[PDB]
Write a protein that binds this ligand. Structure first.
Ligand code: 9FH
Ligand code: 9FH
Ligand code: 9FH
Ligand code: 9FH
Ligand code: 9FH
Ligand code: 9FH
Lengths: 146, 146, 146, 146, 146, 146
């Protein structure tokens, strides 16, 4: 039984993130999105990820606390997956202390420039980033600025 | 049925490569090492990979020709795996033309500086790189310089 | 009528910045330096830029607020110019939301290591950075530490 | 009268290149594409660029020989423009010897992974890169492999 | 009389740091570790460095204040040494204002991923980083979390 | 007795190289420039380095053959010094096989863009790079193109 954890703060989840979720889900038996404890509270973040991933039956969303590698090993998962040198440092640290591996996958070109932080700053100053975020995020983003 | 292809020229295979093979084998149901058509001939390269991977029951070694993505899709595998911006270019090109994904994994620190080319040049000028290569490679390396 | 905006916090403006201003001014009909809202207050920053750019007749200095791309398009300018991957992210975000282009130009070698932040920290601890800053900045820098 | 030269071997011209041509043409009075003296011969390269740039009235295509900065200054142009550290080295060398400036612009995300060399290798091995190249190039590419 | 200063906050000193100290000590007549004014207080930091460097007779530990280049020149030392673009900026700034040179040395592979900050965060959340830190640091680390 | 080897092909030696030689000479008791076996023949290369380094009494020029680390250890020197990730690979390989350390030093800003290859190509096509090369090189460069 193969499994990958996709960790992050997801504040908010982006289409870049969902693309990674989709590709992990295609390769591993199970995917767990670990929301690691900002603009949106934990509950909102979870909802937004769930609402954006209904098309991924083998994906589960879960709040995480502490070391990501503890999360991975506790839930019997087998790997961390994340989208793309700082990560390099963490991946090797994570292999050192817990034997957990990290698989990196390149961003789809069209999402190469979107980040949660940049989306937030642009949204707050009146820019349209709705093409870079899931509709569940867009919906909540509109409501929080209105 | 999940599966990863580990492509390369493997001239010769290094311990860095074997580490990647090992980690792919731990996460995917099947691994195919694709030796893509130099110092060693094709037969030698195959042998060296096979001799170095006997401890990986779900790994298979195979010569490859043409686009790696054709190789992946023909053998029903689901992903390319390789050890680590040029790769970025290829991974996105490979996703564009064939929908094949590429998962990157960081080198173990102790193998961070070993490459087939550098090992060859150092070996040929009398340096000891045997700690960076599988014994089946070391054996053949000694014999080819003697 | 061609035009470039050179945005930044300019706290303070450096000779690296002025070099970029000079090269933009040489290529575009009009240049607007946008001081985006620290050590010096807004008024000081403006003055320092103006005092350092009197030799550039087609350059104008202006305080900016909000998205830089709003500033560009509102003033009918046609491009952002700045001196040199984070910028890459912003440039593509800025092209996405407003269609505004960003042209990057390499620092003159002699100013490759000067930044506003580094100049400030070195100046405050007693180091001589006057060769890296315009005399109007040097003048005000001396007075603020004395 | 402002002007930019877009230099390259353009063997063949890509949609990434055309995007750069388009953005240069939008900012400078005149653009000269300098084809610097491979798969396609000079004549083919010119044709392909011309056929792909008919929608750019202020763009001119011209074969170049020798230093790009000689080309720039001889034709009274004022700047080099190209799409994006090696370039950094050349830009500073070009500023040193001829006072010519280089403005860099980020690739559109969708063309971030396309290069002439990679397109050629993928095309020759049977991959479909027609979405990354102008139809005039696609046409000639089909005919040269058929 | 040759001499190198190894500057840093050393909060705490790591085995990566000690490796650099060792290599500097092997090449220069004298080494001064400059602890530049966090988890451990100044006294603890000093102790930890001293306890970890008893095997280096020509190494001295000293608190530093102000510009590192003032420290270098005041103590008649001749160079800064540190383990490895931000450093590039500082090294050139330091050469500009004080004529002090900086020699960089590559991390040993096995310590490539260890940093004071990352070690602290991992230690605090229950991870075992004792293989990456000197025993004098490990001892104090255990006691501060217990 | 401390000592550094500065290895390279020096075809030709540049002012960037001489700057590194100067800084090594200032920190180590002895410096050996190792010319590792192109435009200029071995004899010319030696001459050019010698003619450009007469002001460095503790510097010696010598042809090298084989592994640089063999050269270092044979001549009882203690370190490799060179001006600045490929180097990273080699430095760690060189530490692995021979225990030889490599100290990197940043280029002076004004020589950041000069390389032997780029100087040659620019010189051959009629560009003036004499400000980037020692007069002994300039002299020979003029004569070889005339
Ligand atoms: C890293 C990231 C963030 C973030 O860290 O805030 C938000 N989106 N993405 C992203 C992920 C994969 C591909 C593209 C973008
Ligand atoms: C890339 C590479 C080569 C090569 O490309 O020649 C030889 N070993 N490795 C390697 C692979 C994974 C980790 C470390 C090293
Ligand atoms: C980026 C920058 C800053 C800054 O961001 O603080 C201050 N100077 N420069 C600079 C600009 C162009 C060339 C060299 C230096
Ligand atoms: C550099 C380049 C090549 C090449 O160098 O072969 C072919 N296309 N592009 C390109 C240019 C701008 C944007 C994207 C791609
Ligand atoms: C930079 C660094 C830190 C830090 O900056 O916190 C802690 N260790 N190291 C280190 C130094 C040399 C080699 C490896 C690691
Ligand atoms: C690397 C190099 C070359 C070369 O490799 O050809 C020629 N000069 N330099 C150089 C060395 C130190 C500083 C600046 C430049």
């Amino acid at each position: 039984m193969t499994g990958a954890v996709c960790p992050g703060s997801f504040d908010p989840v982006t289409l870049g993130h969902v693309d990674i979720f989709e590709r992990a889900a295609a390769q591993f038996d199970e995917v767990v999105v670990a929301i690691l404890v900002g603009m949106f509270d934990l509950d909102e973040r979870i909802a937004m990820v769930k609402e954006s991933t209904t098309h991924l039956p083998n994906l589960r969303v879960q709040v995480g606390h502490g070391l990501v590698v503890d999360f991975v090993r506790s839930c019997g998962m087998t790997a961390i997956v994340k989208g793309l040198e700082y990560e390099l440092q963490m991946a090797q640290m994570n292999k050192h202390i817990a034997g957990v591996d990290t698989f990196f996958v390149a961003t789809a070109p069209r999402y190469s420039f979107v980040s949660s932080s940049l989306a937030k700053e642009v949204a707050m100053l009146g820019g349209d980033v709705s093409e870079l975020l899931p509709e569940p995020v867009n919906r909540r983003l509109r409501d929080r600025l209105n």
